[PDB]
Short mmCIF file of C-alpha atoms and ligand atoms in Angstrom, two decimals:
data_model
loop_
_atom_site.label_atom_id
_atom_site.label_comp_id
_atom_site.label_asym_id
_atom_site.label_seq_id
_atom_site.Cartn_x
_atom_site.Cartn_y
_atom_site.Cartn_z
CA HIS T 1 0.00 0.00 0.00
CA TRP T 2 1.17 3.58 0.39
CA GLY T 3 4.28 4.42 2.33
CA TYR T 4 7.41 6.60 2.31
CA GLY T 5 9.77 4.59 0.14
CA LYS T 6 10.93 5.34 -3.38
CA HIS T 7 8.35 2.96 -4.83
CA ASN T 8 5.31 3.86 -2.71
CA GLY T 9 6.08 7.35 -1.31
CA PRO T 10 4.73 10.87 -1.81
CA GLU T 11 5.46 10.98 -5.56
CA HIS T 12 3.23 7.96 -6.12
CA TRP T 13 0.28 8.80 -3.87
CA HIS T 14 -1.68 10.69 -6.51
CA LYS T 15 -2.40 7.49 -8.49
CA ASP T 16 -4.63 6.07 -5.75
CA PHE T 17 -5.45 9.42 -4.17
CA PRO T 18 -5.85 12.03 -6.96
CA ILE T 19 -6.60 14.76 -4.37
CA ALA T 20 -2.82 14.64 -3.76
CA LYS T 21 -2.74 17.28 -6.57
CA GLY T 22 -5.70 19.23 -5.10
CA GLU T 23 -6.20 22.86 -4.23
CA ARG T 24 -5.63 22.69 -0.48
CA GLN T 25 -2.92 20.12 0.16
CA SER T 26 -0.60 19.99 3.16
CA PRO T 27 2.06 20.52 4.32
CA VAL T 28 3.25 23.87 2.97
CA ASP T 29 6.22 26.12 3.40
CA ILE T 30 5.34 28.99 5.75
CA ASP T 31 6.91 32.10 4.21
CA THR T 32 7.01 34.27 7.32
CA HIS T 33 7.34 37.51 5.40
CA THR T 34 4.22 36.75 3.30
CA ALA T 35 2.06 35.58 6.18
CA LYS T 36 -0.12 38.39 7.52
CA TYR T 37 -1.11 39.17 11.10
CA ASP T 38 -4.88 38.69 11.43
CA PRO T 39 -6.56 40.77 14.14
CA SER T 40 -9.82 38.82 13.62
CA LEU T 41 -8.22 35.67 15.14
CA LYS T 42 -9.85 35.07 18.45
CA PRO T 43 -7.65 33.81 21.33
CA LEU T 44 -6.58 30.18 20.96
CA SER T 45 -7.70 27.72 23.76
CA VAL T 46 -5.96 24.42 24.33
CA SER T 47 -7.82 22.64 27.14
CA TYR T 48 -6.10 19.35 27.85
CA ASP T 49 -6.45 19.03 31.65
CA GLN T 50 -9.07 16.23 31.37
CA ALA T 51 -7.36 14.34 28.57
CA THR T 52 -7.67 10.55 28.77
CA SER T 53 -5.02 8.76 26.81
CA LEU T 54 -5.63 5.08 26.12
CA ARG T 55 -3.09 3.36 23.92
CA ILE T 56 -0.06 3.75 21.66
CA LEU T 57 -0.05 1.99 18.29
CA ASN T 58 2.63 1.45 15.61
CA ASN T 59 0.49 1.66 12.45
CA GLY T 60 3.32 1.03 10.00
CA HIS T 61 3.64 4.72 9.10
CA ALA T 62 4.15 6.39 12.52
CA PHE T 63 2.95 5.73 16.08
CA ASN T 64 -0.33 7.14 17.35
CA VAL T 65 -1.13 7.98 20.95
CA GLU T 66 -4.91 7.60 21.09
CA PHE T 67 -7.39 9.36 23.37
CA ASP T 68 -10.89 8.71 24.61
CA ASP T 69 -12.92 11.13 22.47
CA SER T 70 -16.39 9.91 23.61
CA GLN T 71 -16.88 13.21 25.57
CA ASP T 72 -15.36 16.68 25.46
CA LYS T 73 -12.25 15.76 27.57
CA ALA T 74 -9.37 17.39 25.65
CA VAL T 75 -10.47 20.09 23.25
CA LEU T 76 -9.15 22.86 21.03
CA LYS T 77 -11.21 26.04 20.52
CA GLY T 78 -10.67 29.67 19.50
CA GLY T 79 -8.09 31.00 17.08
CA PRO T 80 -9.45 30.51 13.60
CA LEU T 81 -11.91 27.88 14.80
CA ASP T 82 -15.71 28.07 15.16
CA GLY T 83 -16.84 25.59 17.76
CA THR T 84 -15.16 22.82 19.58
CA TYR T 85 -12.67 20.25 18.33
CA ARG T 86 -11.96 17.08 20.31
CA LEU T 87 -8.49 15.48 20.54
CA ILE T 88 -8.48 11.97 19.08
CA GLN T 89 -4.76 11.16 18.64
CA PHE T 90 -1.30 12.59 18.27
CA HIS T 91 1.67 11.36 16.28
CA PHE T 92 4.96 12.61 14.87
CA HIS T 93 6.87 12.78 11.62
CA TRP T 94 10.66 12.65 11.74
CA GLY T 95 13.84 12.24 9.73
CA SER T 96 16.81 9.93 9.40
CA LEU T 97 19.02 12.91 10.30
CA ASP T 98 18.44 15.98 12.46
CA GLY T 99 18.36 18.31 9.45
CA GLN T 100 15.07 16.92 8.14
CA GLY T 101 11.84 15.40 9.38
CA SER T 102 9.26 18.14 9.61
CA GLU T 103 6.39 18.40 7.13
CA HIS T 104 5.76 22.10 7.34
CA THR T 105 8.83 24.29 6.81
CA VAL T 106 9.46 27.86 7.96
CA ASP T 107 11.18 29.99 5.33
CA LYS T 108 12.28 26.62 3.84
CA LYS T 109 13.82 25.51 7.20
CA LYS T 110 13.24 21.85 8.00
CA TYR T 111 12.99 20.85 11.68
CA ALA T 112 14.06 17.45 13.02
CA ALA T 113 10.44 16.37 13.60
CA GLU T 114 6.88 17.62 13.79
CA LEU T 115 4.12 16.70 16.29
CA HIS T 116 0.50 16.60 15.07
CA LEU T 117 -2.33 16.74 17.64
CA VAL T 118 -5.43 15.74 15.63
CA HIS T 119 -8.88 17.02 16.59
CA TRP T 120 -12.35 16.66 15.05
CA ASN T 121 -15.22 19.13 15.01
CA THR T 122 -17.86 17.96 17.46
CA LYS T 123 -20.68 19.40 15.31
CA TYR T 124 -20.23 16.32 13.07
CA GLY T 125 -20.62 13.76 15.81
CA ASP T 126 -17.76 11.31 14.92
CA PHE T 127 -14.34 11.53 13.28
CA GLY T 128 -15.60 9.57 10.25
CA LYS T 129 -18.28 12.12 9.48
CA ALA T 130 -15.92 15.00 10.25
CA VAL T 131 -13.58 13.81 7.44
CA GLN T 132 -16.40 14.40 4.94
CA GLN T 133 -16.47 18.13 5.82
CA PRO T 134 -14.32 21.12 4.81
CA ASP T 135 -14.08 22.21 8.50
CA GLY T 136 -14.04 18.71 9.97
CA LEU T 137 -10.57 18.63 11.52
CA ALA T 138 -8.08 20.89 13.29
CA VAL T 139 -4.47 19.80 13.59
CA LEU T 140 -2.14 21.54 16.03
CA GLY T 141 1.37 21.22 14.61
CA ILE T 142 4.48 21.69 16.77
CA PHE T 143 8.04 21.63 15.50
CA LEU T 144 10.79 19.67 17.27
CA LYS T 145 14.41 20.82 17.28
CA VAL T 146 17.28 18.88 18.84
CA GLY T 147 18.77 20.40 21.92
CA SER T 148 17.79 19.79 25.53
CA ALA T 149 15.45 16.90 26.42
CA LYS T 150 11.69 17.40 26.65
CA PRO T 151 10.70 15.78 29.94
CA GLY T 152 7.04 15.40 28.93
CA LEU T 153 8.13 13.34 25.90
CA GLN T 154 10.14 10.77 27.83
CA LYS T 155 7.23 8.45 28.69
CA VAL T 156 6.52 8.19 24.94
CA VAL T 157 10.16 7.40 24.22
CA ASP T 158 10.35 4.75 26.87
CA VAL T 159 7.35 2.75 25.53
CA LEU T 160 8.64 2.60 21.94
CA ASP T 161 10.62 -0.63 22.58
CA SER T 162 7.25 -2.36 23.16
CA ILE T 163 5.70 -1.23 19.84
CA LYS T 164 8.70 -1.73 17.56
CA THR T 165 6.85 -3.21 14.59
CA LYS T 166 3.72 -2.53 12.60
CA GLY T 167 0.53 -3.60 14.34
CA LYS T 168 1.95 -3.64 17.89
CA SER T 169 0.21 -1.58 20.54
CA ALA T 170 0.59 -0.96 24.27
CA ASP T 171 -1.38 0.58 27.10
CA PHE T 172 -0.72 4.25 27.36
CA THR T 173 -3.09 5.56 29.97
CA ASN T 174 -2.52 8.60 32.12
CA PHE T 175 -0.32 10.51 29.64
CA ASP T 176 -0.62 14.30 29.85
CA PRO T 177 -0.21 15.93 26.42
CA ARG T 178 0.24 19.35 28.11
CA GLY T 179 3.87 18.29 28.55
CA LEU T 180 4.43 18.42 24.79
CA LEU T 181 3.57 22.11 24.32
CA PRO T 182 6.04 25.04 24.08
CA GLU T 183 5.55 28.15 26.26
CA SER T 184 4.00 30.32 23.53
CA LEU T 185 0.77 29.65 21.65
CA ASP T 186 1.64 32.08 18.84
CA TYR T 187 0.73 30.38 15.58
CA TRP T 188 0.23 30.43 11.85
CA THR T 189 -3.00 29.05 10.33
CA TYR T 190 -4.24 28.04 6.89
CA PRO T 191 -6.74 25.63 5.33
CA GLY T 192 -5.20 22.31 4.24
CA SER T 193 -5.38 18.57 4.28
CA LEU T 194 -4.26 15.40 5.92
CA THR T 195 -0.59 14.88 5.04
CA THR T 196 -1.03 11.11 4.71
CA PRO T 197 -3.34 9.18 2.40
CA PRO T 198 -6.27 9.64 1.96
CA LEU T 199 -5.04 13.31 1.93
CA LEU T 200 -8.55 14.61 2.68
CA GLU T 201 -9.01 18.40 2.49
CA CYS T 202 -10.72 18.80 5.86
CA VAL T 203 -8.09 20.41 8.07
CA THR T 204 -7.66 23.82 9.65
CA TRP T 205 -3.93 23.80 10.35
CA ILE T 206 -2.63 25.65 13.43
CA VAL T 207 1.18 25.54 13.44
CA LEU T 208 2.93 26.92 16.52
CA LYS T 209 5.79 29.33 15.95
CA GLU T 210 7.80 28.17 18.98
CA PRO T 211 9.48 24.73 18.52
CA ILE T 212 9.91 22.39 21.45
CA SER T 213 13.39 21.08 22.11
CA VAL T 214 13.97 17.32 22.39
CA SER T 215 17.29 15.58 22.99
CA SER T 216 19.29 13.76 20.40
CA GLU T 217 18.70 10.60 22.45
CA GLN T 218 14.94 11.04 22.33
CA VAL T 219 14.77 11.41 18.53
CA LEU T 220 17.32 8.58 18.09
CA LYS T 221 14.79 6.27 19.78
CA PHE T 222 12.07 7.31 17.30
CA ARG T 223 14.45 6.19 14.56
CA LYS T 224 14.73 2.66 16.01
CA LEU T 225 11.05 1.92 15.26
CA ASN T 226 10.23 -0.23 12.27
CA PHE T 227 7.85 0.25 9.35
CA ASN T 228 7.66 -3.52 8.88
CA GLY T 229 5.78 -6.15 10.85
CA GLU T 230 7.33 -8.66 13.25
CA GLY T 231 9.14 -11.46 11.43
CA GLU T 232 9.78 -9.34 8.34
CA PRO T 233 13.04 -7.72 7.24
CA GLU T 234 13.80 -4.61 9.17
CA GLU T 235 12.96 -1.24 7.64
CA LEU T 236 13.72 1.58 10.07
CA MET T 237 10.84 4.02 10.52
CA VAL T 238 12.60 7.24 9.41
CA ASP T 239 11.76 9.95 6.90
CA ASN T 240 7.99 9.50 7.31
CA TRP T 241 7.26 13.07 6.13
CA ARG T 242 5.57 14.50 3.07
CA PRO T 243 7.39 17.48 1.54
CA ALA T 244 5.83 20.91 1.13
CA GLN T 245 3.04 21.17 -1.46
CA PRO T 246 1.97 24.12 -3.64
CA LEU T 247 0.26 26.88 -1.70
CA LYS T 248 -2.18 27.58 -4.62
CA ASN T 249 -4.87 30.10 -3.70
CA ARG T 250 -4.15 30.28 0.04
CA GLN T 251 -3.09 32.86 2.55
CA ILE T 252 -1.29 31.95 5.76
CA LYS T 253 -2.40 34.09 8.70
CA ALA T 254 -0.34 34.85 11.81
CA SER T 255 -1.80 35.25 15.29
CA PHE T 256 1.07 37.53 16.35
CA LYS T 257 2.32 40.99 15.29
N1 0VX L 1 -0.46 13.85 9.34
S1 0VX L 1 -1.96 14.15 9.52
O1 0VX L 1 -2.42 15.14 8.57
O2 0VX L 1 -2.27 14.43 10.85
N2 0VX L 1 -2.73 12.85 9.04
C1 0VX L 1 -3.68 12.14 9.69
N3 0VX L 1 -4.25 11.14 9.16
C2 0VX L 1 -5.40 10.61 10.07
C3 0VX L 1 -5.48 11.70 11.00
O3 0VX L 1 -4.25 12.48 10.79
ZN1 ZN L 2 0.82 13.99 10.78
#
């Protein structure tokens, strides 16, 4: 199926998923001089104090930390958003080397990794219905640079040995995603898509300006995961990012002056 290799990676996805060449694909390069401060942006609200994490899964493309989204427990509101968006999962994209890994870029700069906190608009009832809507999803994107360790990441790092291969999962209750956030909530926003197949154009992207720092040891452990299943030849899970796509008829707005 689809993946990140030379024979099934981003250059091939359009054959099964023609929206790959659509009008609102993600990620994009964020040209900081072209982005415009938007005074209509209401304050952003990240309310994760009641989050209920459940499980961590290696899905063959990345690992997902999944949340109970059966009630408004961890929600995103404000900023460009109308209404309430419920956290369903987070995951990362990362590189083989520290100089690449992020999906979005900032003035063409690539970060070592990028965290995506995925939320769905509660007006549509379920995630599956939300992904049939142009305002179905909101993804909070956070860049990772290598420097000092991120303490709130370490519990994720330490469980990765138990989900090495595709299809493995582990309990991952009582994880607090507040520990993955930078100090500032300044952000850029634009309308886009999922960055993995099926590449659906349902996402309001909110990309924080401030990266979090993680240690070289932390990202090195991401790179020991495997794309393959148990019993198959080892394919390290690295370079699971889609490059920047054409901006087309979009404007990136900044929340900050
Ligand atoms: N990288 S991404 O756009 O968050 N992609 C997905 N796919 C399912 C939900 O999030
Ligand atoms: Zn993602």
